[PDB]
Amino acid sequence: GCHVDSRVDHLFPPSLYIFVIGVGLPTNCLALWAAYRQVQQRNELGVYLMNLSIADLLYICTLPLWVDYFLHHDNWIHGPGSCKLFGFIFYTNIYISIAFLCCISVDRYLAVAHPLRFARLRRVKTAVAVSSVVWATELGANSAPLFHDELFRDRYNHTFCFEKFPMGWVAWMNLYRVFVGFLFPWALMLLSYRGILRAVRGSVSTERQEKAKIKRLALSLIAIVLVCFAPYHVLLLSRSAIYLGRPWDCGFEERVFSAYHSSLAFTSLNCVADPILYCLVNEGARSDVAKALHNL
């Protein structure tokens, strides 16, 4: 194909992943503990929180190898099977996370906007069922690359993993990624939080300060998801709109490593955003975490 390189590609993703590991590992562990406490209190939300934490923790444990993958100018010296498993986890966990945020959002809409109703949908058993369904659907829909070539070895000092420059099947995989793993779940998240705010408007028992607080929190959730995941999918839709565009007439070296890899690294910040946004800002979850740290 056409060779590409970037100098900053070497630097920024590794340090960003070091911060992601060193911060999001203990924070996601603590969020998992708080989620388990919520599950023990017959709460339908903790089980989703449990999956989210889990979906991030696996991702975190995948990251070290990509660190070695990056600081070596894209040189994989750890094998094909490791490439398959670790690339699958790395590229699929972010969509699993987006799906679980959507599930949390819908649960909140059903609880706040429509109380006194849909009690069957707000059980722990139904939450386990939908968690199994989302894990199956996400792991099976994104298992397309597992049945194709693992890596590529272009001899410009590169050795690749779950990506080939240029890039058939990966194009439509990218289109599905962008449209039905980002825009659809994000549309549901936005619509449900708009519903929550409209329901909160008419709350007599809620004073004005708390409505503003809820609005700031909901907007922060939507905005942080968008800012973390939008650059990667924008570049991915642009690159997949040119591989199904002018075919085999593509010079995208000025925008391959820099754009793509900086943006994947920047997508990894969602794994540290979720523990802070869904556990550490709430008072009760912090009380539970303080109880956990009192023991140790």
Side-chain angles (χ1 to χ4, degrees), residues 1-3 5 9-10 13-14 16-41 43 45-67 69-74 76 78-81 83-84 86-92 94-119 121-124 126-136 139-148 151 158-163 165-166 168-200 202-234 236-237 241-242 244-245 247 251-252 254-255 257 259-282 284-287 289-290 292-296:
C2 193
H3 59 55
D5 63 358
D9 186 74
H10 162 266
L16 191 145
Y17 287 140
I18 300 301
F19 154 84
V20 165
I21 293 175
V23 178
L25 181 78
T27 61
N28 264 282
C29 282
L30 294 152
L32 168 69
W33 166 239
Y36 171 69
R37 200 73 191 151
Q38 289 285 285
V39 173
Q40 294 210 348
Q41 276 150 108
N43 189 359
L45 185 87
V47 285
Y48 303 113
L49 298 175
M50 292 295 173
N51 296 115
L52 198 46
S53 296
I54 306 180
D56 298 308
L57 279 167
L58 299 185
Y59 181 91
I60 289 299
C61 295
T62 300
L63 294 174
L65 283 200
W66 293 107
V67 164
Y69 181 76
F70 269 117
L71 61 84
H72 282 101
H73 289 282
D74 291 331
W76 189 284
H78 292 59
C83 184
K84 280 270 181 63
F86 279 43
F88 179 50
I89 297 169
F90 178 68
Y91 285 71
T92 292
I94 72 169
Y95 307 124
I96 285 147
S97 296
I98 297 169
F100 277 121
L101 280 72
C102 172
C103 281
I104 279 164
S105 300
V106 180
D107 200 23
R108 282 161 171 203
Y109 178 73
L110 286 178
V112 182
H114 293 297
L116 291 77
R117 282 178 206 292
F118 317 126
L121 282 72
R122 274 200 327 260
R123 312 217 299 151
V124 294
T126 300
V128 172
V130 306
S131 292
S132 66
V133 168
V134 55
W135 275 100
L139 280 196
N142 296 295
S143 66
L146 265 294
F147 288 90
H148 274 89
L151 61 83
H158 310 89
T159 309
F160 264 60
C161 183
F162 269 4
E163 65 183 1
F165 293 170
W169 62 271
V170 65
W172 277 359
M173 183 76 184
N174 296 351
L175 260 53
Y176 171 105
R177 293 181 184 271
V178 65
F179 271 76
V180 178
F182 194 45
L183 275 296
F184 196 46
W186 195 71
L188 276 296
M189 286 185 44
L190 186 88
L191 265 183
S192 66
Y193 283 119
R194 183 160 150 299
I196 290 171
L197 295 161
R198 184 178 295 113
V200 166
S203 193
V204 176
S205 66
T206 300
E207 65 183 1
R208 184 168 43 88
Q209 323 307 313
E210 293 179 353
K211 291 179 194 95
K213 218 182 298 293
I214 292 166
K215 182 174 73 175
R216 300 200 279 93
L217 173 67
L219 295 196
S220 66
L221 262 55
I222 315 166
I224 191 166
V225 160
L226 183 63
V227 64
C228 291
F229 293 101
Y232 172 41
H233 285 237
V234 161
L236 183 43
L237 183 63
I242 281 283
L244 286 183
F252 82 117
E254 180 180 359
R255 72 140 168 162
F257 291 170
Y260 265 51
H261 297 61
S262 294
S263 190
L264 275 296
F266 184 60
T267 292
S268 66
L269 282 72
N270 186 266
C271 285
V272 75
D274 304 351
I276 297 169
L277 269 295
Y278 287 54
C279 183
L280 282 169
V281 298
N282 186 42
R286 288 207 325 264
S287 179
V289 166
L293 277 296
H294 265 70
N295 296 115
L296 312 181

